[PDB]
């Protein structure tokens, strides 16, 4: 079916030192599979998923060399940015890059991505056509003119339409897979005659999920308390949603869990003894 | 397989 690959790069300038702080994290279907980190004793790309451990030495040496190239590209770019913004002083000048591709069931490029941020805001992005750029401000317009003159978009398009798609195929074959949520309801004291019912969804992947509380198929008037979706640390996610209900009425309430890995949404409740 | 940026800097 549909699949994706992304690389999330962060570079923080340290112009008084040899190179910027640089980290690249790669994802396949939003799951981390590789990473390069300059904060490491011996910086190199490493597998972050067991199915990558069968790639071969040439792959790792090749990826590492590209990262050393990116480190220099980020270092010179950050010096240019320092000048575009009139040497405005700061200890954390940040350039971020996200790139990658979406593959369809029919193996075509659905969408190619390339976008940059400087100082936490959009800077320049390659448009969906993989031919034109959207510039966020005056400084980004300088970059846009430079890249239009040098034909930069063609290099990125060729990567997104080619190498990105080819390697995403290779990875999917190597890695041979959604994890459905397992839910349960916990019961907690709250006030005199009232109780908190907390619906937990655990062990799910992807992170996208919806939790709702209902009474006899109808929505509740109260607003649910919820927590933002959070990683468990094993590649799976957690979330909960709670309601305050009268003591002795708990069994009547139902939690529904909506997730792509579920043939149909879950329905569960707290069962009294 | 990672993208190596086009030689033209920002």
């Amino acid at each position, epitope marked *: 079916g549909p699949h994706s690959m992304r690389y999330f790069e962060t570079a923080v300038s340290r112009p008084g030192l040899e190179e910027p702080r640089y980290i690249s994290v790669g994802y396949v279907d939003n799951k981390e599979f590789v990473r390069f980190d300059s904060d490491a004793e011996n910086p190199r790309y490493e597998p972050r998923a067991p199915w990558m451990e069968q790639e071969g030495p040439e792959y790792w040496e090749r990826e590492t060399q*590209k990262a050393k*190239g990116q480190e*220099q*590209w980020f*270092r*010179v770019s950050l*010096r*240019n940015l320092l000048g575009y913004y009139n040497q405005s002083a700061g200890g954390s000048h940040t350039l971020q890059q996200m790139s990658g591709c979406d593959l369809g069931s029919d193996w075509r490029l659905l969408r190619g991505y390339l976008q940059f941020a400087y100082e936490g805001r959009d800077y320049i992005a390659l448009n969906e056509d993989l031919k034109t750029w959207t510039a966020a401000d005056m400084a980004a317009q300088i970059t846009r003119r*430079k890249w239009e*003159q*040098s*034909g*930069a978009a*063609e*290099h990125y398009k*060729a*990567y997104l339409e*080619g*190498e990105c798609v080819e390697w995403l195929h290779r990875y999917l074959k190597n890695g041979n897979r959604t994890d459905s949520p397992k839910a349960h309801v916990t019961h907690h004291p709250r006030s005199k005659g009232e109780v908190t019912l907390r619906c937990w969804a655990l062990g799910f992947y992807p992170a996208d999920i919806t939790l709702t509380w209902q009474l006899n198929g109808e929505e509740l008037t109260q607003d649910m308390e919820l927590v933002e979706t959070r990683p468990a640390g094993d590649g799976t996610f957690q979330k909960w949603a709670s309601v305050v209900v009268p003591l002795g009425k708990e069994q009547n309430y139902t939690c529904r869990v909506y997730h792509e890995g579920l043939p149909e949404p879950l329905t569960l409740r707290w069962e009294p003894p | 397989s990672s993208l*190596e*940026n*086009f*030689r*033209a*800097y920002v």
Partner: T-cell receptor
Amino acid sequence: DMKVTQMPRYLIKRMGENVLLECGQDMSHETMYWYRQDPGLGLQLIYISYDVDSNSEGDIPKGYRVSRKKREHFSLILDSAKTNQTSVYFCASSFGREQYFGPGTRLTVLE
Amino acid sequence: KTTQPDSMESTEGETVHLPCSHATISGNEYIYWYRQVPLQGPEYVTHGLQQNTTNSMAFLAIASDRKSSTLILPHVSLRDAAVYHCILSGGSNYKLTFGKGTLLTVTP
């Protein structure tokens, strides 16, 4: 507009004297290069400069050193001229598209 | 690396075809063409990544498999006589390796 300068066009130096070859580009391109070319042979890279104080040895760096303190200039230094350094030296710059070359300096080192 | 014929001879006003072979090219390598008149600074002619590119100086034709290319100079002038270098240039790389090139002679 796209112009790389080199002066002089020709230079005679005695063996063992120091030499300073200069190159300039007012377009403030980040990348600059020093090449040499012996007759009948091809251009060979001596050094590349990715930016101010970011210099890397090319294919034939021995007997040369470089200076890049500003992006507009790139210097090639021969601390002690050898007769076999008699050649034509070309400087170049780039912004990421093609390389723009200077007109060259013909250096003749004599005993 | 690229491979080109050592020489090409032509009379002014005719079309010149300069072939280049690069069977081990990678997906990210451009095909650049530079020319150099003896003892003068080399000069960029054209470049392309895929298929065809036209500019004021020349036409570049790249084969569909990208394993060969041709620089085409319609109606050559005496000013076009030079050594023509076909070089692979990594899209992420500033370095070039100049090879032998093709010495193009154009007779009046």
